[PDB]
Design an enzyme around this catalytic site. Structure first.
Site, PDB file in Angstrom:
ATOM      1  N   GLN A 218      52.647  39.921  30.596  1.00  0.00           N
ATOM      2  CA  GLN A 218      51.648  39.646  29.559  1.00  0.00           C
ATOM      3  C   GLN A 218      50.639  38.596  30.002  1.00  0.00           C
ATOM      4  O   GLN A 218      50.928  37.790  30.886  1.00  0.00           O
ATOM      5  CB  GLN A 218      52.349  39.110  28.295  1.00  0.00           C
TER       6      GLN A 218
ATOM      7  N   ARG B   7      44.290  33.607  22.437  1.00  0.00           N
ATOM      8  CA  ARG B   7      44.215  33.333  21.002  1.00  0.00           C
ATOM      9  C   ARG B   7      42.958  34.011  20.423  1.00  0.00           C
ATOM     10  O   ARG B   7      41.862  33.935  20.988  1.00  0.00           O
ATOM     11  CB  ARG B   7      44.108  31.826  20.761  1.00  0.00           C
TER      12      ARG B   7
ATOM     13  N   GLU C 208      48.707  39.995  24.999  1.00  0.00           N
ATOM     14  CA  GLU C 208      49.300  39.357  23.828  1.00  0.00           C
ATOM     15  C   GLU C 208      48.220  38.555  23.121  1.00  0.00           C
ATOM     16  O   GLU C 208      47.699  37.577  23.658  1.00  0.00           O
ATOM     17  CB  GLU C 208      50.442  38.402  24.273  1.00  0.00           C
TER      18      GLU C 208
ATOM     19  N   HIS D 163      38.830  35.859  33.072  1.00  0.00           N
ATOM     20  CA  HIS D 163      38.630  37.180  32.449  1.00  0.00           C
ATOM     21  C   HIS D 163      39.873  38.016  32.602  1.00  0.00           C
ATOM     22  O   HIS D 163      40.731  37.739  33.454  1.00  0.00           O
ATOM     23  CB  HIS D 163      37.413  37.922  33.060  1.00  0.00           C
TER      24      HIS D 163
ATOM     25  N   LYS E 253      23.781  40.255  41.224  1.00  0.00           N
ATOM     26  CA  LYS E 253      24.008  40.471  42.649  1.00  0.00           C
ATOM     27  C   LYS E 253      25.115  41.494  42.909  1.00  0.00           C
ATOM     28  O   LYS E 253      25.126  42.150  43.958  1.00  0.00           O
ATOM     29  CB  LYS E 253      24.357  39.148  43.351  1.00  0.00           C
ATOM     30  N   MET E 254      26.043  41.622  41.955  1.00  0.00           N
ATOM     31  CA  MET E 254      27.189  42.501  42.119  1.00  0.00           C
ATOM     32  C   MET E 254      26.944  43.800  41.344  1.00  0.00           C
ATOM     33  O   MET E 254      27.525  44.035  40.290  1.00  0.00           O
ATOM     34  CB  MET E 254      28.448  41.728  41.713  1.00  0.00           C
TER      35      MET E 254
ATOM     36  N   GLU F 246      36.095  42.110  32.660  1.00  0.00           N
ATOM     37  CA  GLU F 246      35.473  42.794  33.775  1.00  0.00           C
ATOM     38  C   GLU F 246      35.748  44.287  33.685  1.00  0.00           C
ATOM     39  O   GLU F 246      36.839  44.711  33.322  1.00  0.00           O
ATOM     40  CB  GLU F 246      36.151  42.227  35.043  1.00  0.00           C
TER      41      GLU F 246
HETATM   42  C1  LIG Z   1      36.212  37.581  39.918  1.00  0.00           C
HETATM   43  O1  LIG Z   1      36.325  39.006  39.634  1.00  0.00           O
HETATM   44  C2  LIG Z   1      35.856  39.893  40.576  1.00  0.00           C
HETATM   45  C3  LIG Z   1      34.672  39.594  41.319  1.00  0.00           C
HETATM   46  C4  LIG Z   1      33.904  38.395  40.982  1.00  0.00           C
HETATM   47  C5  LIG Z   1      33.411  38.186  39.766  1.00  0.00           C
HETATM   48  C6  LIG Z   1      33.252  36.868  39.113  1.00  0.00           C
HETATM   49  O2  LIG Z   1      33.203  36.793  37.891  1.00  0.00           O
HETATM   50  C7  LIG Z   1      33.086  35.583  39.853  1.00  0.00           C
HETATM   51  C8  LIG Z   1      34.049  34.599  39.633  1.00  0.00           C
HETATM   52  C9  LIG Z   1      33.928  33.353  40.216  1.00  0.00           C
HETATM   53  C10 LIG Z   1      32.820  33.061  41.004  1.00  0.00           C
HETATM   54  O3  LIG Z   1      32.718  31.826  41.574  1.00  0.00           O
HETATM   55  C11 LIG Z   1      31.821  34.011  41.184  1.00  0.00           C
HETATM   56  C12 LIG Z   1      31.948  35.253  40.590  1.00  0.00           C
HETATM   57  C13 LIG Z   1      34.277  40.503  42.296  1.00  0.00           C
HETATM   58  C14 LIG Z   1      34.993  41.642  42.575  1.00  0.00           C
HETATM   59  C15 LIG Z   1      36.182  41.891  41.913  1.00  0.00           C
HETATM   60  O4  LIG Z   1      36.939  42.998  42.165  1.00  0.00           O
HETATM   61  C16 LIG Z   1      36.607  41.043  40.888  1.00  0.00           C
HETATM   62  O5  LIG Z   1      37.734  41.371  40.199  1.00  0.00           O
HETATM   63  C1  LIG Z   2      53.034  33.259  22.690  1.00  0.00           C
HETATM   64  O1  LIG Z   2      54.073  33.922  23.480  1.00  0.00           O
HETATM   65  C2  LIG Z   2      55.282  34.268  22.918  1.00  0.00           C
HETATM   66  C3  LIG Z   2      55.843  33.513  21.836  1.00  0.00           C
HETATM   67  C4  LIG Z   2      55.061  32.407  21.269  1.00  0.00           C
HETATM   68  C5  LIG Z   2      55.044  31.065  21.354  1.00  0.00           C
HETATM   69  C6  LIG Z   2      56.199  30.156  21.545  1.00  0.00           C
HETATM   70  O2  LIG Z   2      57.354  30.517  21.275  1.00  0.00           O
HETATM   71  C7  LIG Z   2      55.988  28.800  22.168  1.00  0.00           C
HETATM   72  C8  LIG Z   2      57.037  27.879  22.294  1.00  0.00           C
HETATM   73  C9  LIG Z   2      56.847  26.648  22.905  1.00  0.00           C
HETATM   74  C10 LIG Z   2      55.597  26.321  23.425  1.00  0.00           C
HETATM   75  O3  LIG Z   2      55.368  25.130  24.045  1.00  0.00           O
HETATM   76  C11 LIG Z   2      54.547  27.225  23.322  1.00  0.00           C
HETATM   77  C12 LIG Z   2      54.743  28.448  22.703  1.00  0.00           C
HETATM   78  C13 LIG Z   2      57.030  34.009  21.271  1.00  0.00           C
HETATM   79  C14 LIG Z   2      57.689  35.125  21.760  1.00  0.00           C
HETATM   80  C15 LIG Z   2      57.141  35.833  22.829  1.00  0.00           C
HETATM   81  O4  LIG Z   2      57.689  36.915  23.452  1.00  0.00           O
HETATM   82  C16 LIG Z   2      55.975  35.397  23.461  1.00  0.00           C
HETATM   83  O5  LIG Z   2      55.557  36.182  24.520  1.00  0.00           O
HETATM   84  N1  LIG Z   3      29.184  38.143  38.689  1.00  0.00           N
HETATM   85  C1  LIG Z   3      28.786  37.111  37.690  1.00  0.00           C
HETATM   86  C2  LIG Z   3      27.922  37.740  36.589  1.00  0.00           C
HETATM   87  C3  LIG Z   3      27.819  36.924  35.308  1.00  0.00           C
HETATM   88  C4  LIG Z   3      26.406  36.542  34.924  1.00  0.00           C
HETATM   89  O1  LIG Z   3      25.441  37.293  35.092  1.00  0.00           O
HETATM   90  N2  LIG Z   3      26.282  35.297  34.462  1.00  0.00           N
HETATM   91  C5  LIG Z   3      25.349  34.881  33.436  1.00  0.00           C
HETATM   92  C6  LIG Z   3      24.677  36.082  32.752  1.00  0.00           C
HETATM   93  S1  LIG Z   3      24.824  36.304  30.948  1.00  0.00           S
HETATM   94  C7  LIG Z   3      26.061  33.934  32.461  1.00  0.00           C
HETATM   95  O2  LIG Z   3      27.284  33.910  32.471  1.00  0.00           O
HETATM   96  N3  LIG Z   3      25.363  32.992  31.828  1.00  0.00           N
HETATM   97  C8  LIG Z   3      24.347  32.206  32.488  1.00  0.00           C
HETATM   98  C9  LIG Z   3      22.939  32.778  32.435  1.00  0.00           C
HETATM   99  O3  LIG Z   3      22.550  33.394  31.405  1.00  0.00           O
HETATM  100  O4  LIG Z   3      22.263  32.520  33.432  1.00  0.00           O
HETATM  101  C10 LIG Z   3      30.054  36.445  37.140  1.00  0.00           C
HETATM  102  O5  LIG Z   3      30.676  35.675  37.908  1.00  0.00           O
HETATM  103  O6  LIG Z   3      30.369  36.714  35.973  1.00  0.00           O
HETATM  104 ZN   LIG Z   4      37.920  39.858  38.491  1.00  0.00          ZN
HETATM  105 ZN   LIG Z   5      53.693  34.998  25.313  1.00  0.00          ZN
END
Ligand SMILES: COc1c(/C=C/C(=O)c2ccc(O)cc2)ccc(O)c1O
Ligand SMILES: COc1c(/C=C\C(=O)c2ccc(O)cc2)ccc(O)c1O
Ligand SMILES: N[C@@H](CCC(=O)N[C@@H](CS)C(=O)NCC(=O)O)C(=O)O
Ligand SMILES: [Zn+2]
Ligand SMILES: [Zn+2]
Lengths: 175, 175
Positions: free
Chosen positions: A26, A30, A92, A119, A149-150, A165
């Site tokens: 999981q 929130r 969750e 994300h 860029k991506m 994503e």
């Molecule tokens: C981070 O998630 C990804 C990304 C990258 C995407 C981002 O959101 C990102 C996160 C941190 C940063 O410093 C710059 C960009 C690129 C390919 C991919 O497969 C993927 O899952």
């Molecule tokens: C939020 O995740 C859960 C919870 C939910 C929350 C907790 O039981 C919890 C206990 C101590 C603490 O420091 C923080 C959170 C309960 C059952 C379950 O399976 C699960 O995945």
């Molecule tokens: N690949 C980038 C793309 C995200 C992106 O374009 N960032 C901007 C676009 S809404 C943002 O988060 N806010 C700053 C802005 O508007 O320049 C990432 O790491 O998420």
């Molecule tokens: Zn990612």
């Molecule tokens: Zn949990």
């Protein structure tokens, strides 16, 4: 300049046999208003609600979403909790009762100060066809597939502002 | 008071066929120091590094961790990316180069104000034995399994302070 591939691999240990049945079960987020979150994750993204738990003393509920066939969900409750909590790759959602009525309240998505979580990401067969549908449904985008860029990767947001994503595994090589 | 079961289910839609092959592929966390993070998730938690991507102009790297057999990882580079990014339930760690040498920088775990993300969670056969081993390896705990009200459930911290739930799906019903 970051770690090289080889240096990174040097930091990785083989899995100890005691961990061999572990699974990544999981990711907990929130949510301000579960009604809106459930609509999004099920109608927009095609997840299934597989379990709901309510804690009236602590005044919260948990919702477990997954990509599972609703017809596989056990009918009997104990079997259903144990099945839902043994599925890989669940989301969750935690609802602290009363947030949906509090106009001053919102959760933080991790992508601005303070930064941490970034994300969740959904692998889709076609990012462009997915995003066209999301556009038709009025989904909020952080980044359209061609923006930035991506090219060919997108980010949308859920009702709380969490980034999701949208990625195509089969295109990330030839891209 | 939170939603009734009936009210929750009424907020859920069936999966549109445009979403039928979607999968929950990744959860992305930012990491200060990939050396410590790789060591934790592989040595302590038994995950495998399945893919690493570096972006030298943007100065960041991506590390994909999963519960996969290393013998399943394709040898050919492009096939490996496509396989890694089509695995369910991966953990993507993002390292912005330089953070490891900035004593004024740290990431936020989402559990203190402003809250949002909570935790990832690992399902294990035996919470208590897993946690005894964790204790022996000097892992930092948020909640040991006998602490607090929810006996038999634990929360550990990774090197960044992200919370990781440790749960036994079969013991969760009966409790
Ligand atoms: C981070 O998630 C990804 C990304 C990258 C995407 C981002 O959101 C990102 C996160 C941190 C940063 O410093 C710059 C960009 C690129 C390919 C991919 O497969 C993927 O899952
Ligand atoms: C939020 O995740 C859960 C919870 C939910 C929350 C907790 O039981 C919890 C206990 C101590 C603490 O420091 C923080 C959170 C309960 C059952 C379950 O399976 C699960 O995945
Ligand atoms: N690949 C980038 C793309 C995200 C992106 O374009 N960032 C901007 C676009 S809404 C943002 O988060 N806010 C700053 C802005 O508007 O320049 C990432 O790491 O998420
Ligand atoms: Zn990612
Ligand atoms: Zn949990």
């Amino acid at each position: 300049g970051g770690l090289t591939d080889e240096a990174a691999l040097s930091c990785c240990s083989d899995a100890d046999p005691s961990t061999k049945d572990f699974l990544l079960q999981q990711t907990m987020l929130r949510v301000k208003d579960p009604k809106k979150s459930l609509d999004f994750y099920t109608r927009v993204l095609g997840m299934t609600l597989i379990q709901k738990c309510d804690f009236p003393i602590m005044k919260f509920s948990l919702y477990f979403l997954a990509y599972e066939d609703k017809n596989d969900i056990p009918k009997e409750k104990d079997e259903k909790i144990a099945w839902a909590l043994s599925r890989k790759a669940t989301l969750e959602l935690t609802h602290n009762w009363g947030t949906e009525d509090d106009e001053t309240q919102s959760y933080h998505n991790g992508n601005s100060d303070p930064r941490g979580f970034g994300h969740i990401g959904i692998a889709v067969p076609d990012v462009y066809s997915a995003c066209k549908r999301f556009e038709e449904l009025g989904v909020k985008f952080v980044k359209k597939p061609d923006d930035g860029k991506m090219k060919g990767l997108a980010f949308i947001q859920d009702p709380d502002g969490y980034w999701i994503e949208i990625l195509n595994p089969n295109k990330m090589a030839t891209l």
